[PDB]
């Protein structure tokens, strides 16, 4: 009975591997071996944003490309203007152990969470001129590790109990639960059209999830350690992953394979975050040795470096116009490069 | 610069004033991480000193202290739950009178102190219920569980030295910070002082290296 099921699983794995072998007629390097490079890329620090009291753990951009929210471990969220370096809002949290933050695509709400296993949602536009807790969402049994908005009253979260969940804010009850991972889930990424998302967990594995159904579409493997970051290509047909084995990788959905690996023989530190550019030609990554690297995404060549931080680069972000990049690190400063 | 921009700048300066008000207290606090077992006198230890992830803020002569109790949540192996690398000391509770679980307590001790995140953090070790240890050693010899005991199984000094030396061998070769240990009853009065002196010595030890004197 059980042995027959295990034999069937082995046969299915063999069939999947053979099918993935039969579709690789040529590699990506050969196709893109007759085009110009991007040359050398140089960036300068336009602004520096000061005022957090401790390490910085996350940040997120607004959809107007001017406003920012950042979270620190002193128990504060701050909303900044970036053209003038003015502080628009400051928010104190009830729980000082915070791990992530998000900014709604309309500008009305913010969300956060951490080691308290709860997701908190704050309202920014009231009639009494102050910010107050709109809602608290509970039901996870592990620390919250990511959250992303879909609408004003639909959110998605991932937790360290090996589960993801889609919630309806107006009612306060879970709508969908996504299960199947073996280890803690570390990151999420929403598709441009908001009908799929991807997750990466501490089993050296990534999964593609449908939203309206609740089932797993595809599973991607090939890394050899934990996965800390993930993001989509601009057109929503490929994604990139970053591990603590000091490599990044590019995966494709339709081809269902792995295309290119970004690694250098002089890097022995893990990766904390990744991101793309507006055209998808440059890939940016942040490392544990307080540096950032800009790679040519079609050739796997180092095309630039960003240096100027002091302790460790923990988070990155690119605006919806491709006009600035923001980095945040463990020395409590945020920097804007252009 | 127009008028509304000036008003916004003034608002930003007020927010800055509040943050600089809080910075002074933030930069003066001492954090201590509490760890113990299920049956150790943890609750009585907290209660008789008039003091999820629980917290306890209090004060000695002039210093503000904060004790962080994880409450048995340390089942997270290594991923990125080790975000307590800004503490000054780890304070362990052990039940000496219950010989049958000493091996488990030792394993839990060896699983924590040998982690690279806690490289520059000192360890304080409280051994609790010593009177019950005196009552138990007379009847049940400690030699029936460990074969390395050497001396009279009825003498407190030999067994206490055995326990201390058995806890010390598990540490790493690197010696940057010491290991303090106390034989205190369930509820004593010098516990606050005992922690105070052991933290003062650690801070002085680190200052002696910050001044290039060593």
């Amino acid at each position, epitope marked *: 009975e059980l042995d027959q099921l295990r034999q069937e699983a082995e046969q299915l794995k063999n069939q999947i591997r053979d099918a993935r072998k039969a579709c690789a007629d040529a590699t990506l390097s050969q196709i893109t071996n007759n085009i110009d490079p991007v040359g050398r890329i140089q960036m300068r620090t336009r602004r520096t944003l000061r005022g957090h009291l401790a390490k910085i753990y996350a940040m997120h951009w607004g959809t107007d490309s*001017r406003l920012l929210v950042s979270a620190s471990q002193d128990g504060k969220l701050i909303i900044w*203007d970036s053209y003038t370096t003015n502080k*628009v809002h400051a928010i104190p949290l009830r729980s000082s152990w915070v791990m992530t933050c998000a900014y709604a695509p309309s500008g009305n709400y913010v969300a956060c969470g951490g080691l308290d296993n709860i997701c908190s949602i704050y309202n920014l536009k009231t*009639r009494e*001129g102050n910010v107050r807790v709109s809602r608290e969402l509970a039901g996870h049994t592990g620390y919250l590790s990511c959250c992303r908005f879909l609408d004003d009253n639909q959110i998605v979260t991932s937790s360290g109990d090996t589960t993801c969940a889609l919630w309806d804010i107006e009612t306060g009850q879970q709508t969908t639960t996504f299960t199947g991972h073996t280890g803690d889930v570390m990151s999420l990424s929403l598709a441009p059209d908001t009908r799929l998302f991807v997750s990466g967990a501490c089993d050296a594995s990534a999964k593609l999830w449908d939203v309206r159904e609740g089932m797993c579409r595809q599973t991607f493997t090939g890394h050899e350690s934990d996965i800390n970051a993930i993001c989509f290509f601009p057109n929503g047909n490929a994604f990139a992953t970053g591990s603590d084995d000091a490599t990044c990788r590019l995966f494709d959905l339709r081809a269902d394979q792995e295309l290119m690996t970004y690694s250098h023989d002089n890097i022995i530190c893990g990766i904390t975050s990744v991101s793309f550019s507006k055209s998808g030609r440059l890939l940016l990554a942040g490392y544990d040795d307080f540096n950032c690297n800009v790679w040519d995404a079609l050739k796997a060549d180092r095309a630039g470096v960003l240096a100027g931080h002091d302790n460790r680069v923990s988070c990155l972000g690119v605006t919806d116009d491709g006009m600035a990049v923001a980095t945040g690190s463990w020395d409590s400063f945020l920097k804007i490069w252009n | 610069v*127009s*008028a509304e921009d000036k*008003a916004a700048a*003034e608002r930003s300066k007020e927010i800055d004033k509040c943050l600089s008000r809080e910075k002074t207290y933030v930069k003066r606090l001492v954090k201590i991480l509490l760890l113990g077992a299920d049956n150790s006198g943890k609750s009585t230890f907290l209660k008789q000193m008039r003091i999820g992830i629980h917290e306890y803020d209090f004060e000695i002569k002039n210093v503000p202290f904060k004790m962080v109790d994880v409450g048995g949540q340390r089942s997270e192996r290594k991923r990125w739950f080790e975000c307590f690398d800004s503490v000054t000391s780890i304070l362990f509770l052990v039940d000496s009178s219950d010989f049958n679980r000493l091996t488990e307590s030792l394993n839990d001790f060896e699983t924590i102190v040998n982690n690279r995140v806690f490289s520059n953090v000192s360890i304080i070790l409280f051994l609790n219920k010593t009177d019950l240890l005196e009552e138990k050693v007379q009847i049940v010899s400690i030699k029936d569980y460990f074969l390395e005991f050497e001396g009279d199984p009825h003498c407190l000094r030999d067994v206490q030295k055995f326990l201390v030396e058995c806890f010390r061998n598990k540490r790493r070769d690197q010696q940057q910070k010491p290991l303090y240990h106390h034989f205190t009853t369930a509820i004593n009065t010098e516990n606050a002082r005992l922690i105070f002196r052991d933290v003062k010595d650690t801070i002085l030890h680190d200052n002696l290296k910050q001044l290039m004197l060593q």
Partner: single-chain antibody
Amino acid sequence: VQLVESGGGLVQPGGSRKLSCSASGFAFSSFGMHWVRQAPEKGLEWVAYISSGSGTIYYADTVKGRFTISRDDPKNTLFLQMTSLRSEDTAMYYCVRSIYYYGSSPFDFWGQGTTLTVSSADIVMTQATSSVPVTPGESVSISCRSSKSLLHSNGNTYLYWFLQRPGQSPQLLIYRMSNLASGVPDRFSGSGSGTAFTLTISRLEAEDVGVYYCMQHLEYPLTFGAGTKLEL
């Protein structure tokens, strides 16, 4: 949200008086406050400004040296002290709340006013008309002109449109020349250029007869228009 004023009455020339205002329902210590004035059978005009934290204080040229403004934040109260009164100070007085940051709406709530009876580089806003009859079901247009460009180098135009119904305090219709306020039906619209502006109303109905005012906010002092009357 509520602002209640007191301290009105009848005085003699050369006297002194103190007006008080009590606030209830919002964070009084995060807003700055304005004192605004209306003469009998005339238009509005601005009197004084005090900011959040008492950092900055502004007066008008006809009240400098005689009037004084203050706030008490624990008690949630605003005070105006007035001395050396004249026959030109007989009027109704309003208290207004204002908050400034990137994207706000600074003149959204007005008080109810008190009555007092006693025994240049400024920008001029014209509003050359005074009245126009109308009938429900059609559309209406109103236009104003200024003596200086209201457009800045940061891409913003500072123009505000207010409405006042018979027997009631004013309210905000439009801020910064194109933004519709909260709770206002979207029949109203605003547009214009650097020195000529228009407000348009589609499908004119009841509860829209009264006086329409326009105001600038480039630089102190703040100056009002003359106001256009709309009757059915």
